[PDB]
Coordinates of C-alpha atoms in Angstrom, one line a residue:
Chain A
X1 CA 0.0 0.0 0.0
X2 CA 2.9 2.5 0.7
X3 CA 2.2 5.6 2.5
X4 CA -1.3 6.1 1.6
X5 CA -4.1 5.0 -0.4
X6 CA -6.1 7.3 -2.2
X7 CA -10.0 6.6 -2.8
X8 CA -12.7 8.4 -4.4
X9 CA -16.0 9.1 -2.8
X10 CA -18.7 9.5 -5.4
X11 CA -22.2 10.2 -4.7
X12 CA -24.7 9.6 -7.3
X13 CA -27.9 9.8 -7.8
X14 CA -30.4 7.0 -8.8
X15 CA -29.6 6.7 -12.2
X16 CA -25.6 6.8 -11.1
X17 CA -25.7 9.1 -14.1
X18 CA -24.9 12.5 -12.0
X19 CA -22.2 13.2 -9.6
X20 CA -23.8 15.2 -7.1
X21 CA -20.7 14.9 -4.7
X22 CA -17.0 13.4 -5.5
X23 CA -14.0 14.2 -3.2
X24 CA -10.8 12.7 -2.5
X25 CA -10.0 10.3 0.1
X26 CA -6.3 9.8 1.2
X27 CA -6.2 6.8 3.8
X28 CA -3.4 7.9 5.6
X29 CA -0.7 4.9 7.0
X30 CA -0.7 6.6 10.5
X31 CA -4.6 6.2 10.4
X32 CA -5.7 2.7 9.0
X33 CA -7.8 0.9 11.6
X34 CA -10.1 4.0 12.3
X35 CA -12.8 5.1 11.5
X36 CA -12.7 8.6 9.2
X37 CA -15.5 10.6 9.3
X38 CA -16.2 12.5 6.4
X39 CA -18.8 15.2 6.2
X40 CA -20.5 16.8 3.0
X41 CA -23.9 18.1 1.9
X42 CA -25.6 16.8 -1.4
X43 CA -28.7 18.5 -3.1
X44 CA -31.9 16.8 -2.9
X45 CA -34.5 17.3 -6.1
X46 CA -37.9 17.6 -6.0
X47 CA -38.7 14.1 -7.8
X48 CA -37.3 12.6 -4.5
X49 CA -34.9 9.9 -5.6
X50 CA -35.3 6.2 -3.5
X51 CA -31.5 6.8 -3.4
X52 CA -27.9 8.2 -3.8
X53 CA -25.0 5.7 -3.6
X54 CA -21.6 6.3 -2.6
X55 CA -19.2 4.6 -4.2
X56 CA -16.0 4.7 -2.6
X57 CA -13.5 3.8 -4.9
X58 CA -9.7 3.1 -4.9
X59 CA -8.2 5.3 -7.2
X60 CA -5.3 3.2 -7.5
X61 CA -6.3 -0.7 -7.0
X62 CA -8.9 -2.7 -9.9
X63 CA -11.8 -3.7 -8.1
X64 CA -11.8 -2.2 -5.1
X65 CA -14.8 -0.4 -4.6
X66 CA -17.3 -0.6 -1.9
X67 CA -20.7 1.2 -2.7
X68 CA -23.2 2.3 0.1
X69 CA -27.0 2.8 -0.8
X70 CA -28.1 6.1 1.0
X71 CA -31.8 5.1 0.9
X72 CA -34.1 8.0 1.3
X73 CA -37.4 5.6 1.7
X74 CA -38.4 6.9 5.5
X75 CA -36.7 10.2 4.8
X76 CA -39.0 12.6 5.9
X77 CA -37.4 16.0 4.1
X78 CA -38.4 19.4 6.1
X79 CA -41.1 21.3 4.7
X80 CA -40.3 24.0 2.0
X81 CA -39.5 26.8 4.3
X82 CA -41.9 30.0 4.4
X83 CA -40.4 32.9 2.2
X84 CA -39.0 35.8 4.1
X85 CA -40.8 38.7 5.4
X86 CA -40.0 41.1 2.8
X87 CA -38.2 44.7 2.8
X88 CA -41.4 47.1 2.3
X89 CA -40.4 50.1 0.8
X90 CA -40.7 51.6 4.2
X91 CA -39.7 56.2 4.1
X92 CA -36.7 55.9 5.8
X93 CA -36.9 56.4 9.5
X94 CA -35.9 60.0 11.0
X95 CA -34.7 59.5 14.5
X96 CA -37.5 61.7 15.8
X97 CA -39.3 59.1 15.0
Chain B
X1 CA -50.6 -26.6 -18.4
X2 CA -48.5 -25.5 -21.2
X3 CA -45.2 -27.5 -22.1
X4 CA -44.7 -26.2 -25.8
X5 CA -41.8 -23.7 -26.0
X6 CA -42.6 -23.2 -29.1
X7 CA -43.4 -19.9 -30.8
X8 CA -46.7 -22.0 -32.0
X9 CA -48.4 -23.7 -29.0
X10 CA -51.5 -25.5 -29.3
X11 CA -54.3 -24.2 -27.8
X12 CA -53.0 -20.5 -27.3
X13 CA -55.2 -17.9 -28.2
X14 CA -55.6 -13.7 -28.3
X15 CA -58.4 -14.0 -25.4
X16 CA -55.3 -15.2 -23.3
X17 CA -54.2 -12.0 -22.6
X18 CA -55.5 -8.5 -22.6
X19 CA -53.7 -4.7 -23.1
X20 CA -53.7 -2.9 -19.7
X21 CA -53.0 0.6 -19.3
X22 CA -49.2 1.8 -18.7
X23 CA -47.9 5.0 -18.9
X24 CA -45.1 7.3 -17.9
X25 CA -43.6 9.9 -15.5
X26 CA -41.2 12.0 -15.0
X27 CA -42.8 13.0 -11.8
X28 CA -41.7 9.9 -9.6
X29 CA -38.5 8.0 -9.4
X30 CA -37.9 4.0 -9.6
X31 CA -34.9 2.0 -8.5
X32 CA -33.1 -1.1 -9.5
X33 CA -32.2 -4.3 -7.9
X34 CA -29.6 -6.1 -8.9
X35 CA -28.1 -9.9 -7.5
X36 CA -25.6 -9.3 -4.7
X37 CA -22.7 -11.6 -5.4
X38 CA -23.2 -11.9 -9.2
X39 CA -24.6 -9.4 -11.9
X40 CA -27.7 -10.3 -13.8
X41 CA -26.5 -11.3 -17.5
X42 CA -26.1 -14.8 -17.5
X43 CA -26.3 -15.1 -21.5
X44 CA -22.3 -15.1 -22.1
X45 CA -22.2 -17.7 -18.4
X46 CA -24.8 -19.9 -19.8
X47 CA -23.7 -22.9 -18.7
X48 CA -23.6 -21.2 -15.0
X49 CA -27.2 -20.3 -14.8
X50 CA -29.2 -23.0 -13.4
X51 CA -33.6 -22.2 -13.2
X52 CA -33.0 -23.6 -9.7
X53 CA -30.1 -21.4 -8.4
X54 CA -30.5 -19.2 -5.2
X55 CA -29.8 -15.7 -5.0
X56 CA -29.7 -12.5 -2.7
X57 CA -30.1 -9.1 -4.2
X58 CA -28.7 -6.0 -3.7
X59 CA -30.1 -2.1 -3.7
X60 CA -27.4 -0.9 -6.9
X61 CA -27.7 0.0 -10.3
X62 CA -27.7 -2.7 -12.6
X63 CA -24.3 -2.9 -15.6
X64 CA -25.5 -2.9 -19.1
X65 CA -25.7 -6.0 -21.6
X66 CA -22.2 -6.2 -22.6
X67 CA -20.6 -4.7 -20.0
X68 CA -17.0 -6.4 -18.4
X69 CA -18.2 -8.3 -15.8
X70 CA -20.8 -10.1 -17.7
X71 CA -18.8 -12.0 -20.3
X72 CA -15.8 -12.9 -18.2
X73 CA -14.8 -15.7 -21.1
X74 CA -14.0 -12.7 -23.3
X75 CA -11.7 -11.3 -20.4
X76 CA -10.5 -14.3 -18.9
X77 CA -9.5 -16.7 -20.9
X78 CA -6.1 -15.3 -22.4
X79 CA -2.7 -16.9 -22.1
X80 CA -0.7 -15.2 -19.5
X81 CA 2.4 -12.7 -20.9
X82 CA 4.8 -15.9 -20.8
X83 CA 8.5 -14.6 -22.0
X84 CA 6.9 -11.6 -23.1
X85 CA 8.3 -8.2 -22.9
X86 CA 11.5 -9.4 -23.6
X87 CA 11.8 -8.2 -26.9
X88 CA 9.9 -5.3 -26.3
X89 CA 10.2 -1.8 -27.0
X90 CA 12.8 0.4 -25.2
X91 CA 10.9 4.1 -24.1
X92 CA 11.3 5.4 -21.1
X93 CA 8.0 6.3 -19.3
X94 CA 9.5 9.9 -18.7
X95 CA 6.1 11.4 -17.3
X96 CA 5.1 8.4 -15.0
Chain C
X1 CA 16.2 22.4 5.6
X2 CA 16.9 21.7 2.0
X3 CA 16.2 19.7 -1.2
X4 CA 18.4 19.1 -4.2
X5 CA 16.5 18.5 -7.6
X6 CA 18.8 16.6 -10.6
X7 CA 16.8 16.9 -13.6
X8 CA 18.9 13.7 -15.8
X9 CA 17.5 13.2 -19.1
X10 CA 16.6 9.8 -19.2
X11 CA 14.7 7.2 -16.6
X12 CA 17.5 4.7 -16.2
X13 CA 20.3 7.5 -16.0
X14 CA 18.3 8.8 -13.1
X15 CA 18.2 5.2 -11.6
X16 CA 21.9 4.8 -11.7
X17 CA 22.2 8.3 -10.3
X18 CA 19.8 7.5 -7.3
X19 CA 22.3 4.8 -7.0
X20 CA 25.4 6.8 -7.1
X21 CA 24.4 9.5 -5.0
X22 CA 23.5 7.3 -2.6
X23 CA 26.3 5.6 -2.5
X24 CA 28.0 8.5 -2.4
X25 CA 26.0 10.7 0.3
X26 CA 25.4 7.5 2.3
X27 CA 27.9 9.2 5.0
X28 CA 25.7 12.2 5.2
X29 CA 22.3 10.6 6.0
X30 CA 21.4 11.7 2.8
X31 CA 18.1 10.0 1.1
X32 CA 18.0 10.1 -2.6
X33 CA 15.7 8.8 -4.3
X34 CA 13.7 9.1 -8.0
X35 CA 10.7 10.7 -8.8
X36 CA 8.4 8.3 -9.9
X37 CA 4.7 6.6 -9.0
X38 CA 1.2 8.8 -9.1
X39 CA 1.4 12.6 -7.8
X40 CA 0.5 11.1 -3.8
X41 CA 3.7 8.6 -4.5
X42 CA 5.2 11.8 -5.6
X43 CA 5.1 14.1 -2.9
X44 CA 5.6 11.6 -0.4
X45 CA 8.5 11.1 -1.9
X46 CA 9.4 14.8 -2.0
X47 CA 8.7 15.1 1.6
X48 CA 10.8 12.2 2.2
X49 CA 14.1 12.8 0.4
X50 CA 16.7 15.5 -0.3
X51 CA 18.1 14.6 -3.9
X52 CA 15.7 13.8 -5.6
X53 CA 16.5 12.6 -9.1
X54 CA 14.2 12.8 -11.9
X55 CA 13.3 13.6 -15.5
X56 CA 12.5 17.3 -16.9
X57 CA 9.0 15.7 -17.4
X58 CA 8.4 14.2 -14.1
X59 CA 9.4 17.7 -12.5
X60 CA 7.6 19.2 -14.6
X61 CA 4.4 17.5 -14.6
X62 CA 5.1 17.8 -10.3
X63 CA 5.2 21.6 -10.5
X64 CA 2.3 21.7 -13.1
X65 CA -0.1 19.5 -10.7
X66 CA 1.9 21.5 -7.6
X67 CA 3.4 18.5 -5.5
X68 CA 6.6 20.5 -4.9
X69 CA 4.9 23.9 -4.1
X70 CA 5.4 23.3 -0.2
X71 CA 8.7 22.4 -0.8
X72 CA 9.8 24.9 -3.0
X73 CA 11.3 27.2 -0.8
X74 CA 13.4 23.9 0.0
X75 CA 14.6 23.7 -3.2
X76 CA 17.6 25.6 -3.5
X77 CA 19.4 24.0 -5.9
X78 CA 18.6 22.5 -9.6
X79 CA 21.3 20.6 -11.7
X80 CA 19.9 20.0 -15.1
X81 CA 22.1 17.1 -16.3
X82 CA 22.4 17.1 -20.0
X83 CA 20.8 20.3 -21.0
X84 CA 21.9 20.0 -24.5
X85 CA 18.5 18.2 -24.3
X86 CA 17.2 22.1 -25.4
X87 CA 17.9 21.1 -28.5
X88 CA 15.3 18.0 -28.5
X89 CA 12.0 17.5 -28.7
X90 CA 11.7 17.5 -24.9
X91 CA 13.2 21.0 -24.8
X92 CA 10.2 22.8 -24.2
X93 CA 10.0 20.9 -20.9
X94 CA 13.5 21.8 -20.1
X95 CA 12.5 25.5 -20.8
X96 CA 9.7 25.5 -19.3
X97 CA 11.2 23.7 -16.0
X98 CA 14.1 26.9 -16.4
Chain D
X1 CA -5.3 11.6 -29.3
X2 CA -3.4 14.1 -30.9
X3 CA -0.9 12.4 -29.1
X4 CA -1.2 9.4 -31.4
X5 CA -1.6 11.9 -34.6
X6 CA 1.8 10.4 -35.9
X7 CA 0.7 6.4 -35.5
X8 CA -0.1 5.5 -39.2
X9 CA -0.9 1.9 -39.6
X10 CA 1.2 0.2 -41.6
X11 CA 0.5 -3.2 -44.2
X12 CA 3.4 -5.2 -42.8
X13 CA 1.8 -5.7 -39.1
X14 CA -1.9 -5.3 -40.6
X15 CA -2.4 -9.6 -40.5
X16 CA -1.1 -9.2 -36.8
X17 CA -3.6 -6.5 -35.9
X18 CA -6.3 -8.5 -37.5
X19 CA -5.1 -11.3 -34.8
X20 CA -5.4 -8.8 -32.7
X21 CA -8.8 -7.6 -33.3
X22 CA -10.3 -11.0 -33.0
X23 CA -8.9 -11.3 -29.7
X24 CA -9.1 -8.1 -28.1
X25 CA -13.0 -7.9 -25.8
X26 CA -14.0 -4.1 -26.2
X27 CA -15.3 -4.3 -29.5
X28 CA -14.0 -1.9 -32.2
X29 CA -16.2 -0.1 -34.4
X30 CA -13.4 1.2 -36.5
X31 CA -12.0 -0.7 -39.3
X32 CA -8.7 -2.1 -39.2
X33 CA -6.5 0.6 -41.3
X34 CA -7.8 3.5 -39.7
X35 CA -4.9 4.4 -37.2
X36 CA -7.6 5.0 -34.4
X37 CA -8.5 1.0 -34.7
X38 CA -4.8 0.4 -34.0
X39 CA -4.4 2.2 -31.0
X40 CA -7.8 0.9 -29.7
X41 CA -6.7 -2.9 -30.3
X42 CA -3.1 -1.9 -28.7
X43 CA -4.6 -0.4 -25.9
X44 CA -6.9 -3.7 -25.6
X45 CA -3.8 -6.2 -26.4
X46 CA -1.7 -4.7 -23.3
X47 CA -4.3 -4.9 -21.0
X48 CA -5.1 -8.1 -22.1
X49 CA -1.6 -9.3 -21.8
X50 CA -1.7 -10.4 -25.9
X51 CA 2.0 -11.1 -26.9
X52 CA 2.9 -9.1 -30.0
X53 CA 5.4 -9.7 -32.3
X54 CA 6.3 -7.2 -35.0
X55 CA 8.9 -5.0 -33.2
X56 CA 7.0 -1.5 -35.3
X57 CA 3.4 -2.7 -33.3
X58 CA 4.7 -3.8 -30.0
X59 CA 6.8 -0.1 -30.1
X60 CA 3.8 1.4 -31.1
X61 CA 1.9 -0.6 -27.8
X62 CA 4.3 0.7 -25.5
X63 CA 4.2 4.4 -26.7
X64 CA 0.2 4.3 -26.4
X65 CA 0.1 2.9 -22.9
X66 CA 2.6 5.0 -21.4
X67 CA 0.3 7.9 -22.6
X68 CA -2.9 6.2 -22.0
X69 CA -1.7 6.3 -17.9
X70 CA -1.8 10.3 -18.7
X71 CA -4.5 10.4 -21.8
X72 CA -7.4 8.0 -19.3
X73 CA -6.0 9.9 -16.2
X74 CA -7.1 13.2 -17.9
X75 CA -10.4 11.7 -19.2
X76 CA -11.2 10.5 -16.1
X77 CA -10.7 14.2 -14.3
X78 CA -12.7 15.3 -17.3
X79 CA -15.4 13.2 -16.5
X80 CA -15.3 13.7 -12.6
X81 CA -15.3 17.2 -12.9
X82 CA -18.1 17.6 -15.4
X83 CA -19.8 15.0 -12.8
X84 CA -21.3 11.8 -15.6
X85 CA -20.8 8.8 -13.4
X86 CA -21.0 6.1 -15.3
X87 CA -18.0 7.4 -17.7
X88 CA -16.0 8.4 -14.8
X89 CA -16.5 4.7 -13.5
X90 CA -15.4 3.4 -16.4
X91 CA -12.1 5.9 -17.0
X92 CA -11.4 5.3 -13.5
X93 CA -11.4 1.7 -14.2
X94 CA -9.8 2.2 -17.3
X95 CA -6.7 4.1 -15.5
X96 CA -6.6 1.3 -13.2
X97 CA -6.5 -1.2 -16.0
X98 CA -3.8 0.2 -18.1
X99 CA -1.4 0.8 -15.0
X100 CA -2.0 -2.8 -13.6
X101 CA -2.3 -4.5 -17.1
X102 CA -5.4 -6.5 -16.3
X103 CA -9.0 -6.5 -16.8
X104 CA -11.2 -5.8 -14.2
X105 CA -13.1 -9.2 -14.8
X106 CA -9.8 -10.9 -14.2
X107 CA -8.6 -12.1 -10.0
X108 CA -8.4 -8.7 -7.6
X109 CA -4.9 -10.9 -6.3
X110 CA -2.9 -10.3 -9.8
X111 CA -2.5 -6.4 -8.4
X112 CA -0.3 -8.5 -5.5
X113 CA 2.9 -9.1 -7.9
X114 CA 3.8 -11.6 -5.4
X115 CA 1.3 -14.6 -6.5
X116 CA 1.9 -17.3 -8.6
X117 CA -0.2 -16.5 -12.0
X118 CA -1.1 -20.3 -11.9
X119 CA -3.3 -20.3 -8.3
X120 CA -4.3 -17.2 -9.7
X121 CA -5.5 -18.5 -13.0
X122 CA -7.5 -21.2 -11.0
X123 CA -9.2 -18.7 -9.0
X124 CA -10.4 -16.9 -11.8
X125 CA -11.2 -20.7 -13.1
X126 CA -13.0 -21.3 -10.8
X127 CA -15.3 -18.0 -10.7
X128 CA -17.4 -17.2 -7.5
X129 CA -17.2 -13.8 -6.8
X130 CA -14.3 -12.0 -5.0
X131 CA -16.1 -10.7 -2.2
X132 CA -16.7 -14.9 -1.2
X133 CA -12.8 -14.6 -0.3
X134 CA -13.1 -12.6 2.8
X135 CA -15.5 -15.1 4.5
X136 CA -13.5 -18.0 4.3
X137 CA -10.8 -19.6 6.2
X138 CA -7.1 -20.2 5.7
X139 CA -8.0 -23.9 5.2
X140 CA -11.4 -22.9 3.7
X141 CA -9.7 -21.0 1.0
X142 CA -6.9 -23.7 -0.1
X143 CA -10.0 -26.4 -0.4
X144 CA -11.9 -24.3 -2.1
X145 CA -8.9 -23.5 -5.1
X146 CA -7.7 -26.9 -4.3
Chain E
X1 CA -49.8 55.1 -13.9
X2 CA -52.8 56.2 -11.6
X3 CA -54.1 58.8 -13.5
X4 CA -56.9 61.6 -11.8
X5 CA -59.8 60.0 -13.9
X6 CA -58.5 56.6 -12.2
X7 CA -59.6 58.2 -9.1
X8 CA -63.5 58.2 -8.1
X9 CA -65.7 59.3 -5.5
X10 CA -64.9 55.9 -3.9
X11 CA -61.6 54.8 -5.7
X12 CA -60.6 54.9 -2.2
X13 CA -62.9 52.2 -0.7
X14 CA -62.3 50.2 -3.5
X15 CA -59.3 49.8 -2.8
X16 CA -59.5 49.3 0.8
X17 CA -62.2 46.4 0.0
X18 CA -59.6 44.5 -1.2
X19 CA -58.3 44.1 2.6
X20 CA -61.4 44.5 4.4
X21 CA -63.7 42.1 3.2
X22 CA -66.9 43.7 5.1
X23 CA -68.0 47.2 4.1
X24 CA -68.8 49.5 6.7
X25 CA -65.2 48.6 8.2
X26 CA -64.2 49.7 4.0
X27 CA -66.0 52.6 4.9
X28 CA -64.4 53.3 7.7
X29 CA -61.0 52.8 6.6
X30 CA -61.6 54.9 3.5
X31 CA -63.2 58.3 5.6
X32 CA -59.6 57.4 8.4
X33 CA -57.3 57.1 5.2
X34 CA -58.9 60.5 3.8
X35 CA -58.3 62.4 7.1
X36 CA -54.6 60.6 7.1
X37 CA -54.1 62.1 3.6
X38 CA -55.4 65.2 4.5
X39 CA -54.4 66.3 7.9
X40 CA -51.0 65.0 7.6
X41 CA -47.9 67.3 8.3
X42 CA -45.7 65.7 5.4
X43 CA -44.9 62.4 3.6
X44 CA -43.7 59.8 6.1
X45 CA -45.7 60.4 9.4
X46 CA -48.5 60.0 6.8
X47 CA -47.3 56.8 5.4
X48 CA -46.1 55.4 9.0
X49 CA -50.0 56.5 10.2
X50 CA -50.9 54.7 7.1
X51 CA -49.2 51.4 7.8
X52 CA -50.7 51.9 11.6
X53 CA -54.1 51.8 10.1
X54 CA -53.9 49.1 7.7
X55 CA -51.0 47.2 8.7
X56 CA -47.7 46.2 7.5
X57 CA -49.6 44.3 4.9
X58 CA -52.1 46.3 2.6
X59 CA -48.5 47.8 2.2
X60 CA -48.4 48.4 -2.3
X61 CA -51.5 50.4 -1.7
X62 CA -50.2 52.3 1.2
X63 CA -46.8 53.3 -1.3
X64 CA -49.7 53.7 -4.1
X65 CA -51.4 56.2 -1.2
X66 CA -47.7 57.5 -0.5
X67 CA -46.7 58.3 -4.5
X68 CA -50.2 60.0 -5.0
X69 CA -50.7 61.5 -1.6
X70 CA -52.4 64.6 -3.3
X71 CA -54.1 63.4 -6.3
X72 CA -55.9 60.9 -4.1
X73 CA -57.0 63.0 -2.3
X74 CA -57.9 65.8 -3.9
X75 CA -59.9 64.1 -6.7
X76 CA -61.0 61.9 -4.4
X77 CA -62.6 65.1 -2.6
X78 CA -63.5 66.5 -6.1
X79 CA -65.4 63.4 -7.4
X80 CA -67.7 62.8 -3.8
X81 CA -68.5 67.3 -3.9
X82 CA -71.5 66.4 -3.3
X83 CA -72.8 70.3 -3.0
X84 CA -71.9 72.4 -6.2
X85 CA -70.4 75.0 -4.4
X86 CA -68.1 72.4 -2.9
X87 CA -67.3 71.4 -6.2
X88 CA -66.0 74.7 -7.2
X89 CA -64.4 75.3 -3.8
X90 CA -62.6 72.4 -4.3
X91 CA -61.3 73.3 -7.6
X92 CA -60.6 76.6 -6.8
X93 CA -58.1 75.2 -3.8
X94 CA -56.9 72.9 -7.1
X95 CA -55.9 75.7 -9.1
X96 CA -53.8 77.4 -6.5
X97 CA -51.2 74.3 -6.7
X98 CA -49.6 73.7 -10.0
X99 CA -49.7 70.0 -9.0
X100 CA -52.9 69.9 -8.3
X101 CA -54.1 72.0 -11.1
X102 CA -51.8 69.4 -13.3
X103 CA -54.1 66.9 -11.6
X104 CA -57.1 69.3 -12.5
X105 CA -56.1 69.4 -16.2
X106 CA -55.9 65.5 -16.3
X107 CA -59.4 65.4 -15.0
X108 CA -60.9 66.7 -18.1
X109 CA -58.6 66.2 -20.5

């Protein structure tokens, strides 16, 4: 393995036809046997997919991959948030006011 | 009761089945499921697909028709590099 | 404190001259080694080693993807072995390397 | 390529390409002399291990593998970065593929140099999947490739 | 775009009945929105008694009551004379206000 193994973390949507999410993974020699936590944020549609999958890949190694269903079946989304409370064209306010 | 394969079966008639509606949508989304420790094209592993087998399956996206993993005799079955690259070509990977 | 980059023209000259070099700054603690593997391998091997022996390409395609750029204020001295090499048709690499 | 703008195919290897072409597994849509056919079927032929004998085709291999690790490496961040994922799995495959010279159908164990290609030719022989390896034993492993 | 012949004797209550749902309480707000626009010192103490009146909401017809503060009002005083002589009183406070007699000429013509 060397120093480091490098991996690529693609999340896809249903299809595995869009990328919503890729980002390099280097699995450090210092830190095999541990568990890496890796935090991102991928966009949700509004024909809400039964999935994305993350595949994490080895971007060095033939047929290692390990993919991960992310199944969105009891995913209960937020509702769409209220729109904000708008700037009415107030007259600006005098401090005698 | 049928036991003709044929594409001419006795006693097969039009009232056998009848057109349903089916439609489209791009407003909901479907999924896939695919066997979990094979793939599903077992027309190039014939011999390897039995009407009795057992398997699990396995929330992914399904590979197409001809894809690697499905004809592993077209992949597979070449004689290894045995004395090759012995009267190869001298170039320097300079780059790699 | 400091790395030593020798650009040799070709791959095997820069193998022999990882093994002369070390050979010869074996008394020093020196670790040379060559530039070679994906860009990862490569900047390991940067971080790793003071001479480091490569091709004008491999440099070059290192500062191009930026596997040196921390250790560029490290490098403090280039030997380009064989620069007639400006007269090939990997001179532009040499060039562009200078 | 442009990279491969100067790789003409010549008459006097033409027979061997056409052993090629029968051999190699991605189908070519190309026709044999068209020069694009010839680097597709070299490509194919080193990753499939083919041995090639006219010294003008197996020069011609090496030159397009050793910029295919550069040419599928730039495809691939091509691919990622416009974000299709099914092209991105298959350059990243393909990346993989030319720099360990095997098909991805073939044994996970020929990226370990250190095997014998014979045990490893009866695993792939004797095809379960990969992912059956892990759950086995020591013992349960060397009964089940005899 | 709100031209004097827009405005009518009850333009005003009109366009308060598209908040108040009920009539009288139209009423009401029309006569309280006419004595905003009329005994009002200047422009934003009458558009901040405005928006006390009818709300932060109702708020493009408060800035359409802000933009036209004296054409409003004053044709909305001309068209409900209900006398003659107010009529012509009316008028002849018009005419001694180039806006309003602007206001006075788009009436007619």
């Amino acid at each position: 393995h060397g120093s480091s193994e490098a991996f690529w973390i693609l999340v896809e949507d249903v299809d595995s036809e869009v990328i919503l999410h890729h980002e390099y993974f280097l699995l450090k020699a210092k830190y095999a046997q541990d568990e890496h936590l890796i935090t991102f944020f991928v966009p949700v549609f509004e024909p809400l997919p039964p999935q994305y999958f993350i595949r994490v890949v080895s971007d060095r190694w033939l047929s290692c991959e390990t993919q991960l269903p992310v199944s969105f079946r009891h995913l209960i989304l937020p509702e769409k948030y209220p729109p904000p409370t708008e700037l009415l064209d107030l007259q600006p306010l005098p401090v005698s006011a | 009761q049928n036991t003709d394969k044929g594409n001419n079966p006795k006693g097969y008639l039009p009232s056998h089945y009848e057109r349903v509606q089916m439609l489209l949508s791009d407003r909901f989304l479907g999924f896939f499921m695919v066997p979990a420790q094979s793939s599903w094209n077992y027309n190039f592993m014939g011999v390897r697909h039995d009407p009795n087998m057992k398997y699990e399956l396995q929330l992914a996206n399904p590979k197409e028709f001809y894809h690697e993993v499905h004809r592993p005799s077209h992949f597979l079955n070449f004689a290894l590099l045995q004395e090759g690259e012995v009267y190869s070509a001298d170039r320097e990977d300079l780059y790699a | 404190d400091f790395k030593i980059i020798y650009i040799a023209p070709m791959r095997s000259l820069v193998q022999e001259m990882v093994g002369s070099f070390g050979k010869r700054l074996a008394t020093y603690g020196i670790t040379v080694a060559e530039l070679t593997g994906d860009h990862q391998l490569c900047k390991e091997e940067i971080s790793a080693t003071q001479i480091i022996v490569c091709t004008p390409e491999k440099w070059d395609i290192i500062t191009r993807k930026g596997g040196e750029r921390t250790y560029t204020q490290l490098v403090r001295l280039i030997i380009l072995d064989e620069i007639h090499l400006l007269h090939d048709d990997r001179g532009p690499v040499l060039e562009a390397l200078v | 390529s442009s990279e491969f703008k100067n790789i003409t195919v010549r008459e006097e290897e033409k027979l061997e390409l056409q052993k090629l072409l029968e051999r190699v597994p991605i189908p070519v849509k190309e026709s044999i002399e068209e020069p694009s056919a010839k680097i597709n079927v070299l490509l194919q032929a080193f990753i499939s291990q083919l041995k090639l004998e006219g010294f003008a085709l197996m020069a011609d291999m090496v030159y397009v593998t050793q910029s295919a690790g550069r040419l599928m490496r730039a495809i691939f961040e091509i691919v990622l970065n416009r974000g299709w994922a099914q092209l991105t799995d298959k350059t990243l495959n393909l990346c993989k593929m030319i720099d360990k010279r095997m098909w991805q159908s073939m044994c996970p164990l020929r990226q370990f140099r250190k095997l014998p290609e014979e045990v490893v030719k009866k695993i792939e022989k004797k095809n379960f999947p990969f992912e059956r390896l892990y759950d086995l034993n020591h013992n349960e492993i060397g009964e089940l490739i005899r | 775009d709100l031209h004097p012949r827009d405005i009518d004797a009850f333009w005003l209550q009109r366009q308060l009945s598209r908040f108040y749902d009920d009539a009288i309480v139209s009423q009401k707000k029309a006569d309280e929105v006419l004595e905003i626009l009329k005994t009002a010192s200047d422009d934003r103490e009458c558009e901040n008694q405005l928006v006390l009146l009818l709300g932060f909401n109702t708020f493009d017809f408060i800035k359409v009551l802000r933009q036209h503060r004296m054409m409003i009002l004053y044709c909305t005083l001309l068209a409900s004379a209900q006398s003659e002589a107010e009529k012509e009183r009316i008028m002849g406070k018009m005419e001694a206000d180039p806006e309003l007699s602007k206001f006075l000429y788009q009436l007619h013509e």
